[PDB]
Amino acid sequence: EVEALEKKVEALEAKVQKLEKKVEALEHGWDG
Amino acid sequence: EVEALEKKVEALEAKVQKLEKKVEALEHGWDG
Amino acid sequence: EVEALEKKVEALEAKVQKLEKKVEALEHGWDG
């Protein structure tokens, strides 16, 4: 069950990184 | 402690899904 | 390995909270 949790956590990590990139773009006016 | 971690992870999953929906809306001009 | 997972989860929690704050700002027109 530990390994399954790590995989969920890793999936959230990638989701969160992609969210951070989009939000920083929206907030700074990146890429227009 | 494993079960408590899963509940935290699940809470983040719902937070992250709601974040993804809002950010996709902001970025595509959904709902005006 | 349990403790290392909790630290990752906690890091995501702080990331997610900061994302929620920025997204709520973008969506309500906070701070201009």
Side-chain angles (χ1 to χ4, degrees):
Chain A
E1 165 53 37
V2 164
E3 196 199 293
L5 223 36
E6 320 189 42
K7 279 191 246 285
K8 286 181 126 205
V9 158
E10 279 138 17
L12 282 169
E13 289 175 326
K15 282 181 156 57
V16 168
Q17 163 157 329
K18 200 55 213 96
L19 280 169
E20 281 172 352
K21 293 176 169 183
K22 301 176 135 125
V23 169
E24 289 305 328
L26 286 167
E27 248 166 2
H28 292 131
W30 293 350
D31 323 307
Chain B
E1 165 53 37
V2 164
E3 196 199 293
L5 223 36
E6 320 189 42
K7 279 191 246 285
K8 286 181 126 205
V9 158
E10 279 138 17
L12 282 169
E13 289 175 326
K15 282 181 156 57
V16 168
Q17 163 157 329
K18 200 55 213 96
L19 280 169
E20 281 172 352
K21 293 176 169 183
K22 301 176 135 125
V23 169
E24 289 305 328
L26 286 167
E27 248 166 2
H28 292 131
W30 293 350
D31 323 307
Chain C
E1 165 53 37
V2 164
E3 196 199 293
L5 223 36
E6 320 189 42
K7 279 191 246 285
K8 286 181 126 205
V9 158
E10 279 138 17
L12 282 169
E13 289 175 326
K15 282 181 156 57
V16 168
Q17 163 157 329
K18 200 55 213 96
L19 280 169
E20 281 172 352
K21 293 176 169 183
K22 301 176 135 125
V23 169
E24 289 305 328
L26 286 167
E27 248 166 2
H28 292 131
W30 293 350
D31 323 307

